Amino acid sequence: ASVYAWNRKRISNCVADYSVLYNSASFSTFKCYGVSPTKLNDLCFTNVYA
Amino acid sequence: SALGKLQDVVNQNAQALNTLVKQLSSNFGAISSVLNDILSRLDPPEAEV
């Protein structure tokens, strides 16, 4: 979607492997703010939104 | 209220201990007041701060 109508998807009731996001070189920018990128596989979350 | 002088000292010491215990719940401007949360969430360059 366009940026004025940006699409928000809820992520819930799943086990998430974020290690395929860090180790992928396809992303030009992979920048996390409140959390380390390599600790995402070690934590549990709710209210995940894309 | 006959024994108020001893109870005043006991209440002051217990209140000082309760304040010192309560001060661990404050983050003092950090993202969290729990050290394990910071050490499990962040890389050492920003976890150091």
Side-chain angles (χ1 to χ4, degrees):
Chain A
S2 50
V3 71
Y4 89 100
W6 51 271
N7 184 57
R8 186 165 191 110
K9 188 170 178 66
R10 184 176 176 87
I11 296 90
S12 62
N13 190 359
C14 74
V15 57
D17 193 6
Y18 307 87
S19 193
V20 303
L21 282 72
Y22 194 67
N23 299 323
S24 183
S26 299
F27 305 123
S28 312
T29 301
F30 183 78
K31 187 201 306 184
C32 303
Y33 273 76
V35 65
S36 171
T38 187
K39 303 288 183 171
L40 294 174
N41 277 41
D42 301 336
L43 311 185
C44 280
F45 304 106
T46 191
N47 273 286
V48 183
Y49 296 102
Chain B
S1 60
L3 276 300
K5 294 185 68 37
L6 315 177
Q7 195 65 63
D8 190 359
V9 177
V10 172
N11 286 357
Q12 284 184 291
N13 286 310
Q15 169 203 261
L17 293 174
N18 285 341
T19 300
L20 187 72
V21 170
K22 181 64 68 68
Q23 280 297 98
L24 291 179
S25 71
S26 289
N27 47 42
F28 304 104
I31 54 159
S32 187
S33 61
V34 182
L35 277 176
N36 287 335
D37 290 12
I38 291 165
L39 286 162
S40 61
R41 278 163 60 176
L42 293 180
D43 284 337
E46 62 270 14
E48 164 157 356
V49 179

